[PDB]
Symmetry: C4
Subunit: 184 residues, 4 copies
């Protein structure tokens, strides 16, 4: 459990040292691991692959209980739509200053905010926090990123690929409007 973490990070330390990365850079990497993994590390994909559909769906719904509550997207949504969304989400942690999205680039994923603050820059800046999502526009229109999104504070986010976005909207077509009104 905690042994896996310390061993994995030692390898990371050796990697950074082998490539002679700068001190401050190694400190940034260190902080990332602590914030992201919290001293413990699991082969989740492996543990979840041992379970069945129902169990996996129960675990995701529980782990994301807080996130689902903050999101109006699931305001009064179909519980199965919620599950279809959650099971396809990928947990990611961002650091202050990080460029989550860069304007003019091809977008292949959107983000759901669990906890943290991001600045949307296209024009003047704008703030988005817990509950809200961003990066859905290019997913609907297939165009380029309509803005850059720099991380303001430590951000605990859940991303969704364009493929998974579309696969979920293939099963719940009318839930597409929710994303459209936010972007329209």
């Amino acid at each position: 459990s905690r042994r896996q973490y310390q061993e994995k990070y030692k390898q990371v330390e050796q990697y950074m040292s082998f490539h002679k990365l700068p001190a401050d850079f190694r400190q940034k990497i260190h902080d990332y691991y602590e914030h992201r993994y919290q001293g413990k590390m699991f082969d989740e994909d492996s543990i979840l692959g041992e379970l069945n559909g129902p169990l996996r769906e129960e675990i995701v719904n529980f782990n994301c209980r807080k996130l689902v509550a903050s999101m109006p997207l699931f305001a009064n949504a179909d519980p199965n739509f919620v599950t279809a969304m959650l099971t396809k989400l990928k947990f990611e942690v961002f650091q202050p200053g990080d460029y989550i999205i860069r304007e003019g680039t091809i977008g292949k994923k959107m983000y759901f905010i669990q906890h943290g603050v991001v600045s949307v820059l296209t024009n003047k800046e704008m703030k988005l926090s817990d509950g809200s999502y961003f990066g859905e526009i290019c997913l609907l229109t297939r165009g380029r990123r309509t803005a850059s999104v720099r991380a303001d504070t430590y951000c605990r986010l859940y991303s969704l690929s364009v493929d998974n976005f579309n696969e979920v909207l293939e099963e719940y077509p009318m839930m597409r409007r929710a994303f459209e009104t936010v972007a329209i």
Copy 2:
């Protein structure tokens, strides 16, 4: 052998504890592992990948000897059709109350019952047990699940994906009628 199981489950215990899952939930997970793996755990895909075609086909035919005997589907079927089916099946264990299939959703797999009882709900309920299969309709018509299937008792089932379903019917086209009459 048994060491792999206990080690894998300890990681599972740590995972559940790390995510502060409720007690009763951890008990449900515990029961699943015992029913599904039975105290022993093997990297089957790995062991089978070391063998050859014939050996793998012999093992599947033997391991599923009981299942093949209960199924009328293989009533008087071509032994090679049986093998083509077995090699593509995925063993799964379900718990009482579990939703194996949910009505109105996109279906991507069907199920063959080795041992257990399921309730088919669309209308009044219906029971299906050893030997029978379910979830084939959307696989033939490509529509939505025509009913929900909640697990009544511990169910030891073998699933078949739509792709594998079609791949097998590409090699044994006339065996498609068997599935159709059950659903017609």
Copy 3:
């Protein structure tokens, strides 16, 4: 090295015991491992992935030196055609009585004989040994297996998938005739 083998086979022994396979069956599996791996076991794909193109190509050409010499297919062929073929081949070992190919089934691979004897049955039987290949017909015509091929003796064979077969013929189009005359 040899430790990896003994450990891997112990897991295999536990697997067979867990599934209560018959004695004679466990003996057949045992003989397979000894003939196929010869007491030593390597993560080849892993070792080869650490090397570069040239090294990997040198190793395959050396390991298959004997096989290339027995094959008229490479009679006076382009050395690069030989390499293109070798790098895509998969080493397989078959036991006496084994059905390598079954008539009327969809074929997805052909075989090159390094050492051993096979019986081609469609009509009366026919024998093929070192140097010769079989199962190319359905690969050229895309039809069904034109015959069954039961292993007569321990067979050390190298298989080639239909995809790899075609990919190699895309780069060496005229080498297709060699396969055609054998099947014509």
Copy 4:
């Protein structure tokens, strides 16, 4: 760290011995490992998979700082184009005499020179060193390799697949001209 290397190479030694490779060949393999891995070995793909987008992009930009400086390709290029290119590059080491590219074959990748000298042979020979790239022609025209490229000295190169080449040019279409003028 260094333990992983020595253990991995011992397996390599056993592999070479198991296949009775010649002495000089085993010496060539030995030299490759030392030049390529430098006594240390990391599961990079694994370490990088634990990080996030930004961190991974920072690491690649730093590790390839020297390579980016030697390349005119990035003369005054968009920093994001540089990143898009770097993240898709695969580090490879070649030995003196090695055939990196063979004339008349289907090309599926191009190469960027970090350090070393190659001979381009189609006609008389030609030398290319640090900063320059080669093998882009067939990537633009989809034809066959217009020349062979034998490694003159130890070459530390970064390859780019045709798919990744095109994916990067889909996001930075006008950067295609840079490759064209070099090949025109």
